[PDB]
Amino acid sequence: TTRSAEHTTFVIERRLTAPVARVFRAWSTPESKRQWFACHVPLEYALDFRPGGTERNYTADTDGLLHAYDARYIDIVPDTRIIYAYEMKLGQTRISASLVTVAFDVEPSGTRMVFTEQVVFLDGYGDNGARLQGTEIGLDNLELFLVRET
Amino acid sequence: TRSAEHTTFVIERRLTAPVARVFRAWSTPESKRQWFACHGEWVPLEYALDFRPGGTERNYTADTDGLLHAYDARYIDIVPDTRIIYAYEMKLGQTRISASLVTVAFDVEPSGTRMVFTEQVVFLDGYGDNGARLQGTEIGLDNLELFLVRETSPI
């Protein structure tokens, strides 16, 4: 059928009302990341937060289809930046690959976070803005997670 | 002083070779090394290709002033004769200067092969690329073309 690739980039910017060390721990700590990112529950979740390390989040939807997120960290600067690449498969079908940059900056009060994703959608997978929308929601969950551990 | 600059570039070429041959120039370690790793007055230090999803490629070369240019890639998706997707990092010494997601797509044309190379890159911490990666990639893809030409079978 359609073997094809569609590329796009999106950027999300948030001011977080938490100190950067706490914000970063929400990304680097397996229990924390599983909570705000993966539970909103996975069949498999693992996080090895090191350059070269991997993250997995495998979850089945209500009708049995396995959604498999696999990431590999490329660059981690403590309390400053996280760069990783990830792929999403549904069943055995790869639907996308992305390079993600998350940058953190101290402000006189909170933390500014800029999330940039450079993604390719594969073989006619119909994104139609859903990845951006889902990431906005995911980042809303990170914010609630930070608020509730205050 | 930490920072990140994002960009995407696309190179499209029409290659005067059949797609099977074009794809083997990417999939075959000895072939890839010839057009990707063989330049020039620099010191080749390491080349390796493990061409499969999850596999890695390394190309480490020292420039004439002794700076190690270290290319490390990891394949994400490979569709035989059709598409290669990989992510890579470039380090100079131990300093990471960039990370990229590359998509290479191959299409059969009435005559030859259409190749579309798309790179989504982030340049790190003020590394001043200023279009140099695009220009270097254009030159590298020119070397692929010469490789293919010289591998051609006679009439």
Sheet containing strand B56-62, strands side by side: B4-15, B113-124, B95-108, B83-92, B68-79, B56-62, B43-49
A63 token code pair = 């009708």
DSSP SS3 for B2: coil
* Experimental technique of record: X-ray
- Going by C-beta distance under 8 Å and a sequence separation of 6 or more, which residues neighbour residue B6? A9, A101, A116, A118, B120, B121, B122, B123
Instruction: Give the C-alpha separation, A67 to A88, whole Å.
Output: 7
Instruction: Give the C-alpha separation, A29 to A25, whole Å.
Output: 6
Cis preceding linkage at B128, omega within 30: no
Instruction: Give the C-alpha separation, B81 to B78, whole Å.
Output: 9
Closest CA to A4 of A133, A149, A120, A141: A120
Residue A144 burial (CB count, 10 A): 11
Fold of B1-155: Alpha-D-Glucose-1,6-Bisphosphate; Chain A, domain 4 (3.30.530)
Contact A77, A56 (CB under 8 A): no
Query: Do the strands A66-77 and A54-60 form a parallel or antiparallel pair, or are they unpaired?
Result: antiparallel
For residue A62, what are the CA distances in angstroms to A59, A94, B38, B75, B103?
10, 20, 52, 31, 32
Shortest CA gap A99–chain B (Å): 6
Q: Which residues of A touch B (CB under 8 A)?
A: 3-5, 7, 9, 72, 74-75, 77, 80-81, 83, 85, 87, 94, 97-99, 101, 103, 116, 118-120, 122
Instruction: Give the C-alpha separation, A12 to A132, whole Å.
Output: 8
Q: Which residues of B touch A (CB under 8 A)?
A: 2-4, 6, 8, 74, 76-77, 79, 82-83, 85, 87, 89, 96, 99-101, 103, 105, 118, 120-122, 124
Contact B46, B55 (CB under 8 A): no
- Going by C-beta distance under 8 Å and a sequence separation of 6 or more, which residues neighbour residue A138? A36, A37, A40
Contact B94, B67 (CB under 8 A): no
Contact A51, A76 (CB under 8 A): yes
Sheet containing strand A5-16, strands side by side: A5-16, A111-122, A93-106, A81-90, A66-77, A54-60, A44-47
> What φ, ψ does residue B47 adopt, rounded to 5°?
-135, 135
Contact B22, B106 (CB under 8 A): yes
Contact A76, A91 (CB under 8 A): no
With residues binned 3-state (H G I as helix, E B as strand, rest as coil), the percentages for chain A, rounded to 5, are 25, 45, 25
Residue A10's closest chain B neighbor by CA? B6
Residue A99 burial (CB count, 10 A): 25
Beta bridge pairs of residue B123: B5, B98
B116 token code pair = 């579309």
With residues binned 3-state (H G I as helix, E B as strand, rest as coil), the percentages for chain B, rounded to 5, are 25, 50, 30
Beta carbons of B74 and A77 less than 8 Å apart: no
Beta carbons of A75 and B124 less than 8 Å apart: yes
CATH 3.30.530.20 fits A1-150, yes or no: yes
- Going by C-beta distance under 8 Å and a sequence separation of 6 or more, which residues neighbour residue B82? A3, B23, B105, B106
Contact A23, A147 (CB under 8 A): no
- The one-character DSSP state at B148 is H
Resolution at which this structure was determined, Å? 1.8
